Amino acid sequence: AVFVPMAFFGGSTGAIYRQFSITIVSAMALSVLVALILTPALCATMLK
Amino acid sequence: GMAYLFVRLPSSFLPDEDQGVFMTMVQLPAGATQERTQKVLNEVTHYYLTKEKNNVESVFAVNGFGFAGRGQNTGIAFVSLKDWADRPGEENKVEAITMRATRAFSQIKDAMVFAFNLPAIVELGTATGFDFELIDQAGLGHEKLTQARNQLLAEAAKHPMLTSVRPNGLEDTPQFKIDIDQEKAQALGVSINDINTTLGAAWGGSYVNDFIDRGRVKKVYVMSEAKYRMLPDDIGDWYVRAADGQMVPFSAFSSSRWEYGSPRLERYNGLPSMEILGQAAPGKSTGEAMELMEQLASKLPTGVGYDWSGNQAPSLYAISLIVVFLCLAALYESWSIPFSVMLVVPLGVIGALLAATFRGLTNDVYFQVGLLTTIGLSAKNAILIVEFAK
Amino acid sequence: GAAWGGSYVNDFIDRGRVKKVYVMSEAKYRMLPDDIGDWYVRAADGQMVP
Amino acid sequence: LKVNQDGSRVLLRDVAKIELGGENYDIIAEFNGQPASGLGIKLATGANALDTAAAIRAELAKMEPFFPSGLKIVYPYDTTPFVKISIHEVVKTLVEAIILVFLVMYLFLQNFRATLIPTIAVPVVLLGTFAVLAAFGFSINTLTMFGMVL
Amino acid sequence: DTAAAIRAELAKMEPFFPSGLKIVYPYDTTPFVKISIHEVVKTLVEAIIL
Amino acid sequence: DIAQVQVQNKLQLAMPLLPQEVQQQGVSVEKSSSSFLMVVGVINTDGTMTQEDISDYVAANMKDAISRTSGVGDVQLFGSQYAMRIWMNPNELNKFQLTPVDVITAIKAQNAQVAAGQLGGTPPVKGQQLNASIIAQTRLTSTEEFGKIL
Amino acid sequence: GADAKTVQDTVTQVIEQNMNGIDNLMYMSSNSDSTGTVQITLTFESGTDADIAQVQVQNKLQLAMPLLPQEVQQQGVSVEKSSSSFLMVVGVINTDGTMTQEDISDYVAANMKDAISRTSGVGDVQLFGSQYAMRIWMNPNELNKFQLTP
Amino acid sequence: NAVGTGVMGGMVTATVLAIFFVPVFFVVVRRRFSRK
Ligand SMILES: O=C(O)c1cn(C2CC2)c2cc(N3CCNCC3)c(F)cc2c1=O
Description:
Bound molecules: ligand CPF
Subcellular location (chain D): Cell inner membrane
Structural class of chain A: mainly alpha
Shape of chain A: rod-shaped
Strand content of chain A: under 5%
Distance between the termini of chain A: 36 Å
Helix content of chain A: 55-70%
Family (chain D): Belongs to the resistance-nodulation-cell division (RND) (TC 2.A.6) family.
Periplasmic side (chain D): 136-141
Transmembrane segments (chain D): 87-106, 116-135
Cytoplasmic side (chain D): 107-115
Largest sheet of chain A: none
Oligomer: part of a larger assembly
């Protein structure tokens, strides 16, 4: 909600601010999905 | 504070950094030769070879090829700095290398040589800097347009909160005009065809035909030994055949006289123009200088017009304010949580500013996204302070 | 061809912009078929021919 | 060119000097004050950059062997090793940021098993970003690599 | 968008015209686009209100 | 976009199978759309000029830019751009003994630009102090000067 | 041979008039030098294909091709992809079997240069010197004493 | 250095401020409850 709206790049500041958020915005969904599938699984499986 | 820690912090685009590789060009006065400019290229090459061994691995001089264009005036030498491990200090890094280098060329010389960190950036977008251009919209000539540019460059430096403005490269050197009296020619009995390919195929060069050399087809050119085309007195050496099987000197039909032309005529968008590379003031920045230059070009004679972080963010962040509140209500419906998080924004950002205002950083691209990430963690922290406690 | 119709000879300069140079004939010497005889061409033996 | 009255043959050598010379003497290069020529390759508006320059050597690799006596290659102004280093210093940061997270994870979680889940969480999340930005068009740019790190 | 930029480029020729040279507009598409949008968006709001 | 290229990179194999009058004339390949949209009239009121003076100034200031600007397929010009026009009197050619072939040849000789070289040539002698370009014939400027061709 | 004014309106202007009807375009520019060397640059909108955009500029230049001096036609007309910035600039010198800054410029340009420009999307190659050419140096006194011209 | 200097500043000041001292507590107090 602050990354992708700013990832609406413009001009010679194109991929600049674009790749900026997205790369990490991609990394947000991948960190969420891991924090919803893997990190849970592993945490349950074996924490203590 | 936060606000003042931000409005006062200067805005760049992307930081110029050491690349293990820089360069530096040459520019001689009006109508200099290949032997004059070559003397300078030597002095340049050796500041790097004798007074910079620890730093420089290898130079690569070039005589007659600037990044303005070409000619015996111009020049450049490509540097290749020894690797970064053997170059430890800040003095052994291109910021400081092009500092005492440029100092040396403004000290012990009588021409123009610089040096620059290769803009890692792109060619364009220096920030606090512009590229103006001066079009001749009406039917004025190159000579009348020149005068308007001398009045533009004058008026900015006449009252510069300043500016730093200069031309691009129209030195304006003289030219050896040869008038051929047409009546005289045919009376002595010469074709104007033959006369033109005498002066053309001697002094300049002429692509005649192709020949074969060791497999690969190359070209065959025709001209004249250097010594018969160095000065204007050597024009009379060339005798052309006339209809009546007998020679005729150039001087007979020739007229010798000098003139003031220009050795490079720029043309922006179908019309003659002249480039004006000026920078923003040391105080002001672009939008100020640019609009304080449009009012100076509009104060010039008739038939002379013109043509040239980001404004980006203002609107980008606007949608960062809209999407937040909704996402701060897709799992946090109330109008209580959607204003909680709304304060962690400048909680953290004040420090982001502070660390970069303290050290020698600026508001570049990496910092502007160092803000957005600082806000994403600010949200996190706060949303846990909320989600759990609710 | 270069009288009745027009012929692209060469380019010249006019107030900056390069334009063209055409060659033809005043209207009155190419309006009717009787005006064909007005044109006399040079012959090898340095004398005109209708 | 001609044969004057008394059958005296005028040749092209008699009236002019004939040597195999350069087509254009306007520019002259001196590698460290020593005479030489070279090749200054320029990019093609939208080219692959590091892959073009990798294939500059590839094509150039087979000209090398048929050089005559003395003809050798040398490299000034070259982009290549800056690419090499920015990758190497960012991937260095990557592993440092893991190792350092692993210590803070152990200091709070004395369980060894516990300093392992987050340690083995983000390794995968990074790879997915390589798989996601590849699928959208991006490269291992200077930008997308600080995007891993940030 | 082409015809909007016909004026855009043409906007900067306007000022350097000599004495008397002025522009005028016959056969022009523009205002039919302007009106069909305006009469349809008028219908839209009428169809809501009603 | 591609369909244009194909037609016009195949026309240009038959380009040298064409009259030379046609080659120096305008060969064009464009995008059709039998239908105008903006047809901007341009008249005079105060400083009166003819339907010919305006057709030139229109076509020597604006037309060049419009056709380029925002994907304009092809511009139409309602009149014509100026050109050094000559009107050969046939009786006046006969009473001196002449043809239009002698008029045409006189313009393709006196009215032209020539590539003369330069002092301090591309390969000079070592130690020269000057280097400036030579000027030769010039493309003529005004009516007056075309009146004085021998 | 041509000076700055000659090229300015015999090659430069001829193209600039016949350089229209093209898709995506903010401006054009030009530099007409005194060495007799002009080169025009057309900058397009960001994200526009450089593949198609090249074709358009160079299949419209080639309508003004027969409106050019014949000296220029047999000379190198080129349309390429710009990138004001080198990357690999491979120096090539001699050590053992000594040769001049001219001998190498030819062998470089008669073995490697041809291949590089082609290879892996190289926009255009720069050559630091020149390829060989049967060079002749006409003595003017020797032409007069037999009665001759170039 | 351009990346981390920008964030390090933010973080030090985001947490050591939020978690403790200034809002991030003080908020829900006067946002949730205050008047409604
Ligand atoms: O997973 C995907 O989206 C893709 C996967 N692959 C690889 C095959 C698994 C691709 C491979 C491509 N190229 C391979 C090399 N030759 C040209 C084609 C490609 F262009 C796109 C993709 C994808 O989008």
